[PDB]
Design a protein around this ligand. Structure first.
Ligand SMILES: N[C@@H](CCC(=O)O)C(=O)O
Ligand SMILES: N[C@@H](CCC(=O)O)C(=O)O
Lengths: 375, 70, 183
């Protein structure tokens, strides 16, 4: 169900748009009836409390006779099965994960010297000053070619390990040439090892996807849509990883249950990966093809539930639906529409298809400012 | 009556699991290595500047033997 | 003047190749450039060392073959399913355009359009080593990955929603007592 460019100027069933809107006409053509479209007054699919079990959501609208035939992406479950009637599943689906997409993090224009501290580089500069000054005082005691331009240049070639032009010949000149070598031998090797430290830590980082690691990770929070089936699929469960999720989500503070899907998307974008989200397979896929393009699907699908056309207990019109659901699956009119709205959204640009070339081999931005100092 | 089935025991599973954990969760990936401190390599400068002053000591003892040339 | 155009390539080369060159510049205008060229290489030689340790320390696995889209683009792999069953007909009922490219290439397969033994498609993929693929039941793939020859891998996800039912003849004497006993 979509909005419309003529949200106010247009009237009737044409006021909105979408898969089920056109699919309603597909049933209305085949079954031969007239329909009036309504919106759920709550804004939620269906709850069932430890209470009088009034279905706060679209189910109670359909149980209590306000609606006649419900058309919605609604989960076929046993708890709904005993209280309303379902058609055959027209779409395959599963529980899936939406997270903040781990994007290209911003490097530094002087990120190459990050394994050292700027306090160290400040001392390296200051040590480079005095050693040339001390050697020159050692050199020019005339009561020799190491002038002030030579003593800087000899110390510069010493520190870069690129050889030297000449050598000191007096004993005290060789002494300061000795200790400067043992100085720079540590510092270069210390720089190389700590540079390897960042790169080995970076590859050690595991992007969590199996959802058991997500259950073992407490920094990334995770929540579901309330008053539906995903909130209830983890209520009654059997797997210890599912129960630990439910033990985490029951004992969660603050409220990980979000009233609508869009605010559930909104918490993920603000969190920069702090807040994960659980939703259906098809609904997670459609947000990927839209264009913030910062949501991706990790892991495999949990189970295989289904969407079905809902009729109340005793509605005679549910069996002609059972005709048309089979017939439009035979011709593929389901698939004719199930294709149509999902390759239409190519507007993300398919950024995942052309950005899977990530590797630990450096970008130029890792070593960019070295060229800046060079040029 | 408690100990025969473990009402002592099974509740001791729960209340010791209940309050959160501080274990192998933060030994593995709650660290990133930092830049080196100066204090990691400070003693090289003490060897460096300590090598600087003793060079001037031999510079002074050169002229003592240089004046001995007589 | 010793820095010819044939000389200046050589001085810059050994500075890049960590080798001390005999001829040094003798000008403040010249010595700056060879100075910063030294500091250029001193990072890059070290950066090549540090990154190459990381490939040797942390190993990664290369498998771009998942999620059934990458199956559909790469035409180097041959698919494998079981005849006289669901997968023989479920892809024969290919209506989805990505599944149309499957079944046409599944009909354009040689020699194994199908296999006949589930344990033989296990054996064939072990000898296939990147030439042949095998599509099958999910928990069948999972169970063989729990058995330990450990040369097995599940990729992608469930292509269909399926389930196993107790086959009873139509008008069974005990079909509905079975169905309640299932419940
Ligand atoms: N399609 C789902 C949405 C709510 C949920 O994921 O729990 C349903 O109607 O049950
Ligand atoms: N259980 C399946 C096995 C064969 C197949 O997957 O195609 C059947 O009898 O149809």
């Amino acid at each position: 169900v979509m909005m419309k460019k003529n949200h106010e100027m247009l009237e009737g069933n044409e006021r909105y748009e979408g898969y089920c809107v056109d699919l309603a006409a597909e049933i209305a053509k085949h079954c031969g009836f007239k329909y009036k479209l309504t919106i759920v007054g709550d804004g939620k699919y269906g709850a069932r409390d430890a209470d009088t079990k009034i279905w706060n959501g679209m189910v109670g609208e359909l149980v209590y006779g306000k609606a006649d035939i419900a058309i919605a992406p609604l989960t076929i479950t046993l708890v709904r099965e005993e209280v309303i009637d379902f058609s055959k599943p027209f779409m395959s689906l599963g529980i899936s994960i939406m997270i903040k997409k781990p994007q290209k993090s911003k490097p530094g224009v002087f990120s190459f010297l990050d394994p050292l501290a700027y306090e160290i580089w400040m001392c390296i500069v200051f040590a480079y000053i005095g050693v040339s000054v001390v050697l020159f005082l050692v050199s020019r005691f005339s009561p020799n070619e190491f002038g002030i331009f030579n003593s800087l240049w000899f110390s510069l070639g010493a520190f870069m390990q690129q050889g030297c032009d000449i050598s000191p010949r007096s004993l005290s000149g060789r002494i300061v040439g000795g200790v400067w070598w043992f100085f720079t031998l540590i510092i270069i090797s210390s720089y190389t090892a700590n540079l390897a430290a960042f790169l080995t830590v970076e590859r050690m980082v595991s992007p969590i996807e199996s959802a058991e690691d997500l259950s073992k990770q407490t920094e990334i929070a995770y929540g579901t849509l309330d008053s539906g089936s995903t909130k209830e699929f983890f209520r009654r469960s059997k797997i210890a990883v599912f129960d630990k999720m439910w033990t985490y989500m029951r004992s969660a503070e603050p409220s990980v249950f979000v009233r609508t899907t869009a605010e559930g998307v909104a918490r993920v974008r603000k969190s920069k990966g702090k807040y994960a989200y659980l939703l259906e397979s098809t609904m997670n896929e459609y947000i990927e093809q839209r264009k913030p393009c910062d949501t991706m699907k990790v892991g495999g699908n949990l189970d295989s539930k289904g969407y079905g056309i809902a009729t109340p207990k005793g509605s005679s019109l549910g069996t002609p639906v059972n005709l048309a659901v089979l017939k439009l699956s035979e011709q593929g009119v389901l698939d004719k529409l199930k294709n149509k709205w999902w390759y239409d959204k190519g507007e993300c640009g398919a950024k995942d298809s052309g950005s899977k070339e990530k590797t630990s081999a450096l970008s130029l931005s890792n070593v960019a400012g070295v060229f800046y100092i060079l040029v | 009556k408690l100990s025969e089935q473990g009402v002592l025991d099974k509740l001791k599973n729960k209340w010791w699991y209940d309050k959160g954990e501080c274990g192998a969760k933060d030994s593995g990936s709650k660290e990133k290595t930092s830049a080196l401190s100066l204090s990691n390599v400070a003693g090289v400068f003490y060897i460096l500047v300590g090598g600087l002053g003793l060079a001037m000591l031999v510079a002074l003892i050169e002229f003592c033997y240089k004046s001995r040339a007589e």
